[PDB]
Amino acid sequence: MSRVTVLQSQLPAYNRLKTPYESELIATVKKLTTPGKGLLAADESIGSCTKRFQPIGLSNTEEHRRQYRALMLEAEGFEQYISGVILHDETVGQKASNGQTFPEYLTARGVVPGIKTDMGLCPLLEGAEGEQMTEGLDGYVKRASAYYKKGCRFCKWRNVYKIQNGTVSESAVRFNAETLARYAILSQMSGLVPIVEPEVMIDGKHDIDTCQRVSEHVWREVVAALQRHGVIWEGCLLKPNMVVPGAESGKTAAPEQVAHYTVMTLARTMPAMLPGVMFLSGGLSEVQASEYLNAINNSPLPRPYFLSFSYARALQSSALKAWGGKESGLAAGRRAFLHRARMNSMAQLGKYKRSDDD
Amino acid sequence: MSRVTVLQSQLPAYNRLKTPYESELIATVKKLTTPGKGLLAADESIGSCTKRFQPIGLSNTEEHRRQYRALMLEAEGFEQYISGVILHDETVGQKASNGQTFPEYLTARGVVPGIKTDMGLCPLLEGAEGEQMTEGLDGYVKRASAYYKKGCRFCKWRNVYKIQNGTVSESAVRFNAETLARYAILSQMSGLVPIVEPEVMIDGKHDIDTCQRVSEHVWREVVAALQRHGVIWEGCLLKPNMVVPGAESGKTAAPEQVAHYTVMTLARTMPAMLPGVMFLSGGLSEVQASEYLNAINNSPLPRPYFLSFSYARALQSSALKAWGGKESGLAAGRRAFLHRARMNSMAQLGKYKRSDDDASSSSLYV
Amino acid sequence: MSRVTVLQSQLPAYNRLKTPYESELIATVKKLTTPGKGLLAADESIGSCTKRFQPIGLSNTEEHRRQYRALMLEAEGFEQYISGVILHDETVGQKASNGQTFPEYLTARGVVPGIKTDMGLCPLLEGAEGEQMTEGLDGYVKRASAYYKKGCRFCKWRNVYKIQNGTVSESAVRFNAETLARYAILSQMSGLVPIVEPEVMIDGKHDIDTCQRVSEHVWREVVAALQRHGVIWEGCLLKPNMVVPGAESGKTAAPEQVAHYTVMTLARTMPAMLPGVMFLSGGLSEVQASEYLNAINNSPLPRPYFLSFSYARALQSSALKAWGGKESGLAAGRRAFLHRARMNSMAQLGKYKRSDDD
Amino acid sequence: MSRVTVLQSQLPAYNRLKTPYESELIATVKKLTTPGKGLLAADESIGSCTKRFQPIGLSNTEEHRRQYRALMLEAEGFEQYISGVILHDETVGQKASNGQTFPEYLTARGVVPGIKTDMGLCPLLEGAEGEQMTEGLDGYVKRASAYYKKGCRFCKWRNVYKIQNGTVSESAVRFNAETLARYAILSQMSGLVPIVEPEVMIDGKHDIDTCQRVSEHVWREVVAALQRHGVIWEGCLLKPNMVVPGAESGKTAAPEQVAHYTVMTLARTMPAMLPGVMFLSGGLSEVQASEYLNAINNSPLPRPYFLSFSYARALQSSALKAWGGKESGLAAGRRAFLHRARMNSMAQLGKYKRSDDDASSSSLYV
């Protein structure tokens, strides 16, 4: 009949992302999936800092925020457990004690610097009341390229799903997945390894089975969106929630159960090629965070991906307390921080022991 | 087996957008789809104004751009042909010669004020080279609420599709449709009637048949995304390209043909509920735009929606020359303008007579 | 730039069906949308026939079902209100008293012979209990071609949707839409104008608003699938349910309300090119069918498509009661039939007068 | 703010197939994924027996066909390699010398009996010329349950995709994916472990990269369709083609390139929960099928799934020539079969020695 001459890039099967940064994104992924190491999330918003600086009588100020990061980033020895640090936009431009910017300081000390690139949560305006979307795509490439030049080699974007009445709307399921996928593509085009975070929040009275179903449903659509946008699989990371019961369920779960549900859900949704899964703690206690990761790393279920951590609260709670926002507490805070970082390092190895936590 | 109580809004079938502005949106649509009337698109970018000031040798200054609009906005008796005006961000805050802002001015003249809310084209970064997406969704509701407060009651957002080698990438077909749909929802939530502009550009060597295929393909996906986002069909409008031969195809279609193809492609993709289709001139001459629109309004094919215009170039090029960017040219400028306005008003009614119009008209394709 | 020559048919934008039957299909559609006329649905299964021969004491036999169709068809002057007849596989091969096969008998009188091509409902085996799918796609072209050679020029296929708890499963919504879509394509490739019947059943306690929501949700997905499979819009017809309250809701809707909801739903989902909509009576009484249709043809809402009927019950009820299965009842049975046919004919024209049914 | 009580099963997140055979389907998967064991494919259509007996000159009859199967199904000591057999319809009814039907036989010999349940390729009638669909979904459960009663515990259905001009149409990518996904659900509900066969045919002059792209594209949709239909991943298998250059490509890929390209394309589209991948020969020589598998099983790339085989030709070819059809050739016949089966069992374990096979293996392509 008729035959036409078209651009190979106009054919569906040739939608894979093409970027001269590919080789580098994979080298970064390799650095981020180093046995016994995980990511330190230090990207808290100025508003979230307030919720940290308040219980220690620390005025939430620009200088005190730098000290809060410094407490951890300049805790010589944490590099052994932390392969990457997700930085807040403010911190990327702050200097360490030696005059080096934090990205320079971390790089020079063998730690990959990362950056939170989303612009915050907003009402979905579709679906159910309470559901939220995430802004940030407009002017993303310009923002990311600037972070790249400053030293960052990976980034993080977070979308949230809120389980209400044992389910979540399709509007939320579809839209937030498309947001995450587009975000990952623009990230790779900018030379930044994207950490895709589709967090099914722990808030609510639902049980672990409900979390499992919603987690699976939410995650599979995220993967489809990713396939749809031609993401380079070997160049990205997933930062999901573990599958556990809700904070108001009054019910708790055993390390092995969480491991079974979490590993099984990832396996049923994620492509074997996905390089790593750096869990978020969000809601779980410091100890549970390590107990669960440890169990996950002992799971008999299939899991080709590196299973580690991307914690904020779980690595900081005890540290901030001992620290107390005071220079005379840096020693204690860093001791507490290194201990938590070490416990999780061993959890990634599956060699964690509750005994080491008293 | 097991039962559970969920919010009705969590069920797929109950995804229609909920806004307190519904009534007002529908009323606006009704005003914007008045027989014999069309929309004037005067939302060009500062950068786009420079290209228009070239023929007349005018300096692209803020004040000159104000006069450029006032030239048309303050043209006595234009409301007989114009039901709404798409304003540029800047013009929204500028005053008319009587002191009130253009939105206040237009509103008093019974003309609905509109605003171009998209933030421009950017490389798609997926699909084929040359394809572009449109930014502007971030912080959208905020900007839209402010416009609503100033008087605007409708808006316009444009996505473009470039026919290359007789096709467009799926990455572009899906993504831009999705952007348009999300935009329609945020606009309606903000109280602004959204004019969705999915433009298959006239750029290329492609023929009317290829433009027909791509248009049907590009538009049906726009419709799919709108249904997924639960757009209020009764409260939105479409601003599509007419289906015609590529600017470099070397061919030119007859009104009857353009009418057939355009109306055929709309009917095959658009829900019969869609209130109206306000065509873009997109490069056609002033006369072509009126000829084609007239034929469209005389088509024996299915077309339940109000079919009119939303022209920029096809309504200004002549009035612009006559004007000459001088004060002395206003009378001449406004006569030309009001003439094309009258012509398109006639074409909308399908009672356009090529006699009462110019015997010649040069291409406007940039 | 890396180009490649491919078949135009391998490109997404070029998926519109290609069949030599086009013009004929459009001619048939033209016939089926003759103002003042509608379709007589006479394709009741053997099982459904038993349900009607019961209240008149007629043994459900081949010869008796033939007579059942003969009552309607051999009614002189019916071609005045009926443009097409949906036949049952059995009838296609049966003969009217003059020796002509029913298809030959219809054609001769200017009435298009139609055929029910689906193979019945079966459990969906996905989604919720009570949901059903429709079999019949395997070996479809062979079957359709055989019917074509027998005089049939159009066909019908029915998929159902059961509202339960004010909703229906996405499994049901997606699968049945895909089924109808494939059906339409195969039919047109065989020379038969497909009458797509996506029926949201009246059964249930739901109210008119629930029917409106589900109908719109169900219908738009049928549309979406028809586009994916590249149906020839100019050559197909829709046989939907009217939007009305559930049969067991204990509520009633005024003809004007039914017209408003029904016309509003079709408009929000059906593309403007759709040729016609021939409503099913299913559940509605003989008069309601007429009243509602009439109200619909007086709706001030957008409706570019021919809005008529495709009734079985609403056209045969009273006729059957008068026929009683007796040869001595043909006169009255037939009078009863033409009456109803005429009423709906006027309804199609929006000139129905209730007094004519008093 | 309105709330409604619905069946949990009407919510999108709860579409996972619910069946009482789950535990069993999984047990069957355990057996079909036994270390060092692959799958024998003796389900060639009757018409395919004539298209394989010609060279060896053997009359095609129910009895001789029974012997064709008897050859290997009765070959002593094949149960250390072949963990399952995909039988043809007819072969399910036939009996083994001992009197027991093949299914009954195999079960006794530990070998799991399976059945080809699809009903052949047909014109897709959508998309590009040459593309094909696969029939058999109508009345499927009825057929499956009959097979279950006779002892069958798994089944196979195969859809094909033709690379033409280096591509395939979405019409095909979408339709065959939905067919396969539906087939999987109906199989599991019928107690049969489904082996999904999304085969990208080796026909054509396309190079390896083009097969990599298409295969990744085709398999993407299969997985997507499977997620929509709610398949029990722990209870199914995939029988895909290897990513090799076209038959008329005028090339040949080394066992290293074939492994890389193949294991990479699987990891990029298959859920990490997929139990196993039983490859097909498609047209590769009896040795390549063993080399490639072996290499595939020596890939450093991620692959949590059991990577084995489900061969026919590359497992019968020789065992066929050295049989002719007489009971005399039951020596050389069963001599060859048990060899090829021994090689693949090695390859499965990644410890296959090419020095063990012949240096003259022609293509089994047709």
Contact B39, B310 (CB under 8 A): yes
3-state secondary structure of B140: helix
Q: Which of B26, B57, B7, B16 is nearest to B320 (CA)?
A: B57
Residues 224-243 of D with CB under 8 A from C: 228-230
Report the phi/psi class of residue B166: left, alpha or beta, with left for phi > 0 and alpha for psi in -120 to 50. Answer: left
Residues of A in contact with C7 (CB under 8 A): 1-4
Residue A41 sits in a domain whose CATH number is 3.20.20.70
Residue-wise over C230-240: b if at least 16 C-beta within 10 A, else e?
Answer: bbbbbbbbbbb
Q: Tokens 């096969």 label which residue?
A: C101
Structure token pair of residue C259: 């017209």
Distance CA(B329)–CA(B332), nearest Å, equals 5
Distance CA(A358)–CA(A354), nearest Å, equals 7
Q: Do C272 and B305 make contact, defined as CB atoms within 8 angstroms? A: yes
Which of B6, B200, B227 to mutate to test binding with chain C, by most C CBs within 10 Å of its CB? Answer: B227
Residue D234 vs residues A306, D179, D238, D297, D348: alpha-carbon distances, Å: 21, 20, 12, 21, 21
Q: Does A128 touch chain B (CB under 8 A)?
A: yes
Q: Residue C101 gets which letter from DSSP?
A: B
Distance CA(D296)–CA(D290), nearest Å, equals 10
Q: Does A165 touch chain B (CB under 8 A)?
A: yes
3-state secondary structure of B108: helix
Least CB–CB distance from A4: residue in C2, C8, C12: C8
First and final C-alpha spacing in chain C: 76
Residues of B in contact with D4 (CB under 8 A): 5-6, 8, 11
3-state secondary structure of C297: coil
Least CB–CB distance from B4: residue in D1, D8, D12: D8
Neighbors of chain A with 3 or more C-beta pairs under 8 Å: B, C, D
**Would you give the distance in Å from CA B255 to the centre of its chain?**
20
Contact B231, B190 (CB under 8 A): no
Contact D198, D246 (CB under 8 A): no
Q: Does A13 touch chain C (CB under 8 A)?
A: no
Distance CA(D76)–CA(D86), nearest Å, equals 18
Q: Which of A190, A185, A128, A124 is nearest to A153 (CA)?
A: A190
E strand residue ranges, D91-192: 112-116, 121-123, 132-134, 154-161
Residue D212 vs residues B301, D24, D344: alpha-carbon distances, Å: 46, 35, 24
Residue C313 vs residues C73, C289, D285: alpha-carbon distances, Å: 15, 10, 64
Q: What residue numbers bound the domain in which D358 lies?
A: 1-366
At CB < 8 A and 24+ separation, what contacts does D99-104 make? D101/D150, D101/D151, D102/D69, D102/D73, D103/D150, D103/D151, D103/D152, D104/D151
Number of domains in chain C: 1
Amino acid at site C66? R
Residue D302 vs residues A284, A311, D218, D235: alpha-carbon distances, Å: 30, 26, 20, 21
Residue A158 vs residues A136, A184, A199, A200, A293: alpha-carbon distances, Å: 10, 11, 7, 11, 21
Residues 183-222 of D with CB under 8 A from A: 213-214, 216-217, 220
Q: Which of C83, C82, C81, C101 is nearest to C93 (CA)?
A: C101
Amino acid at site B82? I
Q: Do D185 and C9 make contact, defined as CB atoms within 8 angstroms? A: no
**D139 vs chain C: nearest CA distance in angstroms?**
8
Q: Does B127 touch chain A (CB under 8 A)?
A: yes
Experimental method: X-ray
Q: What value, to the nearest 5°, has the Cα angle with vertex B204 and ends B200 and B210? A: 60
Which of C15, C210, C228, C268 to mutate to test binding with chain B, by most B CBs within 10 Å of its CB? Answer: C268
Q: Residue C271 gets which letter from DSSP?
A: B
Query: Least CA distance to D14: which residue of chain C?
Result: C127
Amino acid at site C191? G
**C58 vs chain D: nearest CA distance in angstroms?**
32
Q: Do C3 and A8 make contact, defined as CB atoms within 8 angstroms? A: yes
Q: Residue C343 gets which letter from DSSP?
A: H
Distance CA(A10)–CA(A12), nearest Å, equals 6
Adjacent-strand bridge partners of A6? C4
Q: What value, to the nearest 5°, has the Cα angle with vertex A286 and ends A285 and A288? A: 60
B197 is catalytic: yes
C101 burial type by CB count under 10 A (0-12 exposed, 13-18 middle, 19+ buried)? middle
Amino acid at site D340? R
Helices and strands (H, E) in chain A, number of each type = 12, 11
Q: Which of C283, C291, C281 is nearest to C354 (CA)?
A: C291
3-state secondary structure of A3: strand
Contact B152, B114 (CB under 8 A): yes
